[PDB]
């Protein structure tokens, strides 16, 4: 919590008395000028109870309690800029003069840190990645793992954000990132599945091949490297392998997938992971730039799915390398 209580209706008292200003006129004007002159006058807005804004003339009528009132009822008077305010009473005496209303409580660097230090958010200070993403206006720092499940949608609010991943994203299914603007970067990303799936190794220790079905089954183990999960294509390739393999090692869908859904300019830099996949759905002008030794899963490492959305264009693999995968690495 951080939204401190206040009344937008300012208290008005006289300069040398505690008597409250009434039947006065308030002129609103530019920064560090006299607002009285029509040359320096600037648009005064009323913040409505629908959250809308209507433009009114600069004179504001003051009630008998020393508060702002307009339209004969109690309303909130707001401005869209810094301004000068000249408070007058009913006798035309000048109660106050404020050269610049938005200038006040300055000093103490905590307040003034907004205008001179880079913004970033941290995943540890927000309950979820959904909260940290929508609260990111500049940087997004992932300093802890995020547990996700399929169909988890994280809204980034339609902002260009540099996602610097110094920690993993753990889960299975699709971690869906939506509404990332042009030039967004995702760097250092790692994807690891919560469960350890079964893998088979159809090669020797000299890195040849095993063409015997029983030999591939003999190397069956739960690992995320030195093999890839049993494929449907492997069942055709090595005959009788499927029957030998146990049910739990077949029909697997264990991949930790970071899906960028319908975004443009999102380029995944330094893609790594164990049982990892990156699926760009409906995307255009999104690249896989310099992927550093990922290990694939059932979902491809570089997957451009433009079956949903229009035909893909600008979807490239520039630099980098891939390893493993139970399907096409670049598809």
């Amino acid at each position: 919590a951080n939204v401190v209580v206040s009344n937008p209706r300012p208290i008005f008292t006289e300069s040398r008395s505690f008597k409250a200003v009434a039947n006065g006129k308030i002129y609103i004007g530019q920064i560090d000028t006299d607002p009285v002159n029509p040359a320096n006058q600037i648009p005064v807005y009323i913040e409505n109870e629908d959250g809308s804004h209507v433009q009114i003339t600069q004179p504001l009528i003051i009630n008998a309690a020393g508060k702002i009132v307009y339209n004969g009822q109690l309303v909130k008077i707001v401005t869209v800029q810094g301004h000068s305010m000249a408070i007058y009473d009913a006798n035309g005496s000048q109660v106050d003069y404020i050269a610049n209303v938005l200038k006040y409580d300055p000093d103490q660097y905590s307040i003034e840190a907004d205008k001179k230090f880079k913004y970033s958010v941290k995943l540890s200070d927000y309950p979820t990645l959904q909260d940290a993403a929508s609260a990111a206006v500049d940087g997004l720092l992932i300093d802890r793992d995020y547990n996700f499940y399929g169909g988890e949608t994280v809204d980034f609010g339609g902002k260009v954000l540099t996602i610097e991943c110094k920690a993993k994203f753990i889960g299975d299914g699709n971690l869906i990132f939506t509404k990332l603007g042009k030039g967004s970067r995702i760097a250092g990303v790692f994807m690891e599945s919560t469960t350890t799936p079964w893998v088979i190794k159809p090669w020797t220790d000299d890195n040849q091949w095993l063409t015997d079905a029983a030999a591939v089954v003999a190397t069956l183990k739960q690992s995320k490297t030195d093999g890839y999960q049993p494929t449907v294509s492997d069942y055709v390739k090595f005959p009788g392998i499927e029957t030998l393999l146990p049910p739990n090692a077949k029909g697997q869908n264990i991949t930790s997938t970071l899906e960028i859904r319908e975004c443009i300019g999102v380029e995944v830099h330094r893609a790594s992971g164990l049982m990892a996949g990156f699926l760009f759905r409906g995307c255009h002008f999104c690249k896989m730039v310099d992927a550093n030794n990922p290990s694939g899963g059932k979902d491809g490492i570089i997957t451009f799915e433009n079956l949903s959305g229009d035909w893909g264009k600008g979807n490239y693999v520039i630099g980098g390398r891939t390893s493993y995968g139970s399907v096409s690495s670049a598809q």
Partner: protein
């Protein structure tokens, strides 16, 4: 809500409720106070008018709302009937018989004590005898004390 009347602001909103409104927030933001100040120069002509405990307000730095009054608690029950009739023509109306009667009855009470004290006979002339029914007759004319 309303507390003690330490301002003509509390008077004004109560006066607007007597005249027209049915006990709701007024459109007034300085109206009845102007009539109050002008009525308190006819009343309290430097204490030679109707004495209500009134003290004059400068109305320069005072906004003519929170302005000085100094009125008695007793004088409150009078003024809001008088001020109700004063803002009655302002709305193009005329006050009913209840308001004008209590306005005069309240004005009467405030001047009552003043009219009592100032209605007193002056001392006996300086031609009243010293009296030989008063022991040791000496004095020529009279003292002019009693």
């Amino acid at each position: 809500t309303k507390g003690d009347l330490v301002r003509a602001a509390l008077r004004k909103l109560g006066v607007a409720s007597d005249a027209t409104l049915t006990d709701v927030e007024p459109q007034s933001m300085q109206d009845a106070v102007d009539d109050l100040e002008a009525m308190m120069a006819e009343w309290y002509q430097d204490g030679k008018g109707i004495i209500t405990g009134y003290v004059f307000s400068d109305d320069e730095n005072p906004p003519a709302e929170g302005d000085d009054h100094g009125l008695r608690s007793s004088a409150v029950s009078a003024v809001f009937h008088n001020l109700a009739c004063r803002i009655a023509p302002d709305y193009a109306l005329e006050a009913t018989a209840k308001i004008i009667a209590t306005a005069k009855y309240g004005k009467e009470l405030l001047y009552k004590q003043t009219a009592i004290s100032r209605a007193k006979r002056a001392p006996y002339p300086s031609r009243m005898p010293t009296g030989s029914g008063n022991s040791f007759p000496n004095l020529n004319e009279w003292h002019y004390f009693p």
